[PDB]
Structure formats: C-alpha cells, structure tokens
Amino acid sequence: TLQDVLANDALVEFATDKNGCRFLQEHYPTENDNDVHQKLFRKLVEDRAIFLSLCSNMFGNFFVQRVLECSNTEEQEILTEHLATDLYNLCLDKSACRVIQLAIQKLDVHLATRLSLELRDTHLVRLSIDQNGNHVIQKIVKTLPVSSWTFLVDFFADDDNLIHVCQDKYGCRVIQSTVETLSTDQYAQCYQHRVILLRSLMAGVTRNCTQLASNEFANYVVQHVIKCGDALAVYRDIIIEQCLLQNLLSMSQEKYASHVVEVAFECAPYRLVAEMMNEIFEGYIPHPDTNRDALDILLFHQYGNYVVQQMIQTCVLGQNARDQKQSEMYGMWLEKIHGRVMRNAHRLERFSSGKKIIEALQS
Secondary structure, three states: OOHHHHHHHOOOHHHHHHHHHHHHHOOOOOOOOOOHHHHHHHHOOOOOOHHHHHHHOOOOOHHHHHHHOOOOOHHHHHHHHHHHHHHHHHHHHHHHHHHHHHHHHOOOOHHHHHHHHHHOOOHHHEEEEEEOOHHHHHHHHHHHHHHHHHHHHHHOOOOOHHHHOOOOOOOOHHHHHHHHHHHHHOOOOOOOHHHHHHHHHHHHHOOOOOHOOOOOOOOOHHHHHHOOOOHHHHHHHHHHHHHHOOOOOHHHOOOOOHHHHHHHHHOOOOOOOOHHHHHEEEEEOOOOOOOOOOHHHHOOOOOOOHHHHHHHHHHHHHOOOOHHHHHHHHHHHHHHHHHHHOOHHHOOOOOHHHHHHHHHHOO
C-alpha cells in the first residue's frame, strides 16, 4: 500500500496519522538505492514548508527520524539545509526537537557542526532555559567536538548569561553538561585547550558563587563542581577557599546554600576541612559576650542541623584516615561536636532535628 500512498501523494495524510506513520515507519526501505526509498525521500523534501510542518508534528517527526536513520550523506545535506532554515524554532517545539537531537547524533560531523554553529547568534539564554531546547544544547555539547560549540563557552563567559542560565531548572542541567564534557579526559590531551575553556567557565562560577549557591537551581552547579573529582577537584577547593570560607555560618542557615556547605564538608580534603571546622568552632563568628556560638546557632536551625550532621559524618569517616595527626584531629572535632550536642541534648530532644542529631550520634 506504500506504492498506493506514493501514487495518491498522501505522505502527509499518513504521517499526520498515528497508524499511517507507523505504517510508513515499519515499511520504509532502509537501502538508499531502493526506488521506493528515493521516491519517499523526494516526496518528503519537495516542499520545505511541508517538511518542517512534518518535523513539528506529533507523529510525522517519527517518520522524519526514520528517514534520518536510513540516510547517506547526500540525503543528510538536504535534511541539514532544510532543518537549518528554521532550527531555532524547531528546537523550541516538543516534537521537532527530537528530530534535531537525532540529527546531532546521526548526521556527519560537519553537518551537525553546521547545525550547532547556526545557533551562535540566537537567543541562547531562552534556548538553554527552554523545556525542549535544553536537550538540544546538551546533545550538542555531549556529542559534538568542542570546536562545534566553543561559542557556548564564549556565551557563558558573560556573568549575566551564566547567572540567567544557571538559575533555572533546565539551564543548570545545560551548565552541568558543559562542565562535565569539558572536564572529562583532561591531562590526556597534551595541551591546555579544554583546560582554558573550563577555566573560563569556572572563573564566572567563582565570581558569582554566593549568588549561585543560594539559588533554588543554581546551587546544583556548585554541588556538581564540588562532588565531581578529577579535573574539577582543583576548582572545588577554590570554591571552598575563595568563596565559602568566612561565609559558612550565613550559608549554612540558608535554604539552598546549606546543601553546598554539606557537599563541601563531605568532599573537601583535610586541608580545607581543618579551616572549615576551625571557622565553625572557636574561630570566626566570635560572639564576644554570652550570646550564641555558631555551632549553637546551627544546632537549633532548620537547615544548619544538616550541616552539623554532615560534620558528624565527616569526622566519623575521617577517624579512619591513614595519617595519625588527621585521625586524632577528626576525633577531637567529633569530641567537640558530641560534647556540644550532649550539653544541649535535653533542649534538642523537644525538636525533630535535635532528636535526629542525637540518634545520629547513637548510630
């Protein structure tokens, strides 16, 4: 019946139907030299408006994906030009962005490079925070070489663009994908190119870390820097030392930055764990009277109590350190925290968080 739909010119009438597009998708000739394959491709790409309306459709996008799977480089050139005419609005659509991601996966690397470079002068903040275009940006970053999307790094060297993209549910995933792609397989490249691009990102992260860590979604970027080791570990310490120190008590009382403080207490080396512990303990936040200590504030706080729990967990896991001085220092820190909890234990038992802390000190 495929020759019947070739003769009646009802390729739109099948692809705009669920059963019709399933019939086109199942019986599509995978061989490029087939006559029915060539005829169906020609009927697909005769009208650019018809092709782009089929990409933007609930069902016909699957037929466009099936054509894109069974494609040689000439067909890929035709489809690349047709998509690049309206690429930016194609990524914003729920349907056509699937076609764009399969294009980034399955086209030749110069054609997908052309598609990635067609986005370099568009509203990339809107595309990164979009419900649908964020997957296209992530697919471009994770799939294509860095030279195909280096402009994105250049787009994120602006602080306003980095803050606007990071402070969003979808754009923070874009920033995480870019950071995770650039950091991977460093010190196996013999030159510092991805290192310079990653430094260009991390300088903007470092200069804006207090605003990013206190945000609902932009704190995930900071936790991604701290939690991931390897080439990001050197940046982790920087965020601990230049941005988080002298600010532990304020961020630990904050709704979203307390997560960053927990992740920093979890992942820091002993060098920075020592300075963070001495800031929380009898160091900064001095209270030069009979007012509350920083640990006294964080014990009875709805978000700082998890920072105290992470301090307990860090010291418990750090008693088994290979170094003896580090092990006795983690033990002394846990003694300090345990003594301060046991001082206020009868007060802490009246609340859920304090009961959780006391049960954590049990086990």
